[PDB]
Amino acid sequence: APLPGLIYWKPSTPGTRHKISIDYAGLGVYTGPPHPELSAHVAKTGGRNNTGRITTRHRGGGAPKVVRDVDFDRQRVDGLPGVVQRLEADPGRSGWLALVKYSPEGQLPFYRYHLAPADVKAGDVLMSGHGAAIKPGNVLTLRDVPIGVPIHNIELVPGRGGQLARAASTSAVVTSKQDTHAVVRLPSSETRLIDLSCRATVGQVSNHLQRSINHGKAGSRRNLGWRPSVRGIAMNPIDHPHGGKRTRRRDASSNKFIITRAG
RNA sequence: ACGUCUAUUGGACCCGAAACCGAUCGAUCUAGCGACGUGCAGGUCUGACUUUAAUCAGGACCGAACCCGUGUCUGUUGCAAGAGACUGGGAU
Numbered sequence: 001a002p003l004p005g006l007i008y009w010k011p012s013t014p015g016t017r018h019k020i021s022i023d024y025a026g027l028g029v030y031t032g033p034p035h036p037e038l039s040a041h042v043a044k045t046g047g048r049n050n051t052g053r054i055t056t057r058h059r060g061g062g063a064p065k066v067v068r069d070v071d072f073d074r075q076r077v078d079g080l081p082g083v084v085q086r087l088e089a090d091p092g093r094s095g096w097l098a099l100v101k102y103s104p105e106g107q108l109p110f111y112r113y114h115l116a117p118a119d120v121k122a123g124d125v126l127m128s129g130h131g132a133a134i135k136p137g138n139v140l141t142l143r144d145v146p147i148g149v150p151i152h153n154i155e156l157v158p159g160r161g162g163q164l165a166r167a168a169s170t171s172a173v174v175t176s177k178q179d180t181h182a183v184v185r186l187p188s189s190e191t192r193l194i195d196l197s198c199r200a201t202v203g204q205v206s207n208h209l210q211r212s213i214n215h216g217k218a219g220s221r222r223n224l225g226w227r228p229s230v231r232g233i234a235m236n237p238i239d240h241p242h243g244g245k246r247t248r249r250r251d252a253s254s255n256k257f258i259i260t261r262a263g
Numbered sequence: 264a265c266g267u268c269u270a271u272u273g274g275a276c277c278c279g280a281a282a283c284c285g286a287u288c289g290a291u292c293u294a295g296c297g298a299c300g301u302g303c304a305g306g307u308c309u310g311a312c313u314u315u316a317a318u319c320a321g322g323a324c325c326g327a328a329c330c331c332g333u334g335u336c337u338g339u340u341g342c343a344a345g346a347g348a349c350u351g352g353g354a355u
């Protein structure tokens with residue numbers, strides 16, 4: 001079944017034989033480097049902490065890391081009409097961002113990066129507040145969003161920004177409205193109670209094609225900063241003992257907010 | 264008490280381990296990572312863009328610079344405490 005926005009690489013040689021890549025014609029305005037003041041150039045880490053030893057394994061190498069200042073709260077852009085100039089594709093996240101230009105009355109116009117919902121066309125105007133619309137890309141309080149409409153970029157403690165349901169093609173659903181709790185189904189089929197003063201970016205995150213993508217060769221996934229793994233049974237007993245246990249911290253403070261676990 | 268001979272504690276007739284415990288120095292060899300910079304002759308095939316036009320992709324192919332070391336032979340206090348010759352593998 002050919003999806004429209006995927007480049008189906010022809011089997012010319014092994015490696016590009018079973019390779020599927022996302023077309024940048026579906027996202028027509030990705031073209032352009034990251035904005036020169038919304039982005040910096042930070043050194044890559046390689047998986048090593050401040051000591052210098054490896055903490056996370058199988059990481060390192062690849063393209064120069066560029067970091068983008070994505071605004072996950074939209075607190076200081078409340079009540080401001082922001083017209084989306086273009087959509088951008090960052091390699092650091094599964095879902096892609098959306099460049100938004102805000103023109104306030106007393107200040108010169110500026111640009112901000114926010115996560116892109118499914119209904120951004122590089123022409124839409126986004127609005128955030130108590131009185132905002134129900135069209136996708138609006139940030140509303142959990143009280144102002146309906147029951148059963150998909151939402152994303154959810155906060156846990158108000159004023160912190162959006163931390164929940166923000167990967168590619170993911171969304172959360174509000175199913176109940178307890179006065180201070182508001183039971184919400186997180187994308188792992190887990191119900192969590194999120195305070196009503198928290199905010200939800202209404203809509204659904206883009207990059208649904210993320211599941212259908214296929215790096216056909218080791219190099220294309222190695223060039224993303226992923227060094228090769230090694231199986232446990234391929235070693236001597238000193239390195240690994242080769243050749244069903246729940247690991248969440250029990251007696252935590254967040255047991256009170258969850259009704260069912262990740263199903 | 265002195266002298267001699269044994270005995271015990273001491274390293275205790277002498278020489279000889281593999282060791283164990285601490286805390287110095289070493290990534291100028293080598294393994295990984297990170298920052299900056301540089302290099303890849305000549306051709307061949309396939310796909311795409313634009314064409315009055317001095318553009319891109321493929322862990323593509325043959326092949327020098329370059330990287331590695333498959334087989335055989337030489338060498339074995341050797342030219343070399345791991346080299347040489349000819350075949351080889353990769354070379355956007």
Ligand SMILES: [Mg+2]
Pocket residue numbers: none
């Ligand atoms: Mg005596």
Ligand SMILES: [Mg+2]
Pocket residue numbers: 289
């Ligand atoms: Mg040192």
Ligand SMILES: [Mg+2]
Pocket residue numbers: none
């Ligand atoms: Mg050769």
Ligand SMILES: [Mg+2]
Pocket residue numbers: none
């Ligand atoms: Mg050959």
